[PDB]
């Protein structure tokens, strides 16, 4: 819920991190929107 510089397993950006209703498949690590741009990520230690 705060604006932060993030690095998830090398996926580096700046944004506010929020809980999601998106369910990824077990092997998917980040999610992209219609313009091939990252809008969700899986946290590698606790997998939400």
């Amino acid at each position: 819920n705060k604006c932060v510089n993030f690095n998830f397993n090398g996926l580096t950006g700046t944004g506010v991190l929020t809980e999601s209703n998106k369910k990824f498949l077990p092997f998917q690590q980040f999610g992209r929107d219609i313009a091939d741009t990252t809008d969700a990520v899986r946290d590698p230690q606790t997998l939400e």
Binding site: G15, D33, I34, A35, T37, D39
Partner: peptide, 25 residues
């Protein structure tokens, strides 16, 4: 008529007249 990009610095501005003001005119 049927009608995201903000992380790329794109922004959409509202019109000066609302759709209620166009409906009034």
């Amino acid at each position: 008529v049927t009608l995201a990009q903000k992380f790329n610095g794109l922004t959409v501005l509202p019109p000066l007249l609302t759709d209620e003001m166009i409906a009034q005119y």
